[PDB]
Amino acid sequence: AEVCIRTSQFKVNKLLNRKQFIVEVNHPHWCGTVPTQLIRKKLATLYKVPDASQVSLFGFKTKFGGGKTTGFGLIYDDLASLKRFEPNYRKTRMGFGKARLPARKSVKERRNRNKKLRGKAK
């Protein structure tokens, strides 16, 4: 059960301080789907990135019939650059994201009540 990785369309983005590419994974005779964590470690080793936390991988699609999976990947220059530019929902998947806000319905009712009042008591 080996894994082979090939990156198709490589582009370097000086703005946003990252590199973008398409990831292709070949896993013949593998049981199930390849976890995203495993692909990150191989990608970091292949591209000589120091910290594996600098790699971001988006939604993967499995080919019909098995043995191949394709997705999208990002490699940031620094760890600070990743946290500054990444969307919150992807940062939550990694493990360091802001907590979910209260339900929108409660926010709507609170603001509508305050529309009546005017003073410092609103």
């Binding site: 019909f64 019939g65 098995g66 043995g67």
Partner: protein, 182 residues
């Protein structure tokens, strides 16, 4: 609302639903190629009638007309790559001579049986539906797949099937589980 995905139909029912001559002929084709319902024949009719309609319009146009030089070689190329016409026929008036069996032989179900992977058309149908046949290393599960000429030499058993390089089947594994339970 505000959705712009297209769709169309691919078949139509015949006039005169109870014509005895047509009923016998359609029953002939159904048993010879292992089809499921008369709808599989009728979608072949619509493909054939569309091809003849565009050929008839092109032949009315004079030769050396731009819409005849282009779109005339394109349709003839399609027939050659898929195998409906042999390479010897290059005239644009041999498209009008195509028959229903000429298309039904290029289905994956008929190709698998003729090649030798299956012993009958009905055995071929279940093999395709059970993920045992691969075309150029790709598993195909659709019996109506139309095989290209260049793809015929690459039709073989799938590497993930027990008949190829895959693990054992369901009954062999179930028997093994029972043997280990004992």
């Amino acid at each position: 609302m505000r959705n712009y995905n297209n769709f169309n139909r691919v078949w139509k029912a015949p006039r005169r639903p109870f014509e005895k001559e047509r009923l016998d002929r359609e029953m002939k084709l159904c048993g010879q190629y292992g089809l499921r319902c008369k709808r599989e024949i009728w979608r072949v009719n619509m493909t054939l009638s569309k091809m003849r309609r565009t050929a008839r319009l092109l032949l009315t146009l004079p030769e050396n007309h731009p819409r005849r030089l282009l779109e005339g070689s394109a349709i003839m190329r399609r027939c050659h790559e898929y195998g409906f016409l042999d390479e010897e026929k290059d005239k644009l008036d041999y498209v009008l001579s195509l028959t229903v069996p000429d298309i039904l032989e290029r289905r994956l179900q008929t190709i698998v049986f003729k090649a030798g992977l299956a012993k009958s058309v009905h055995h071929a149908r279940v093999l395709i539906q059970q993920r045992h046949i691969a075309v150029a290393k790709q598993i195909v599960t659709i019996p109506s797949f139309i095989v290209r000429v260049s793809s015929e030499r690459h039709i073989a058993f799938a590497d993930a099937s027990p008949f190829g390089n895959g693990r054992t089947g369901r009954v062999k594994r179930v028997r093994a589980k029972a043997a280990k339970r004992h």
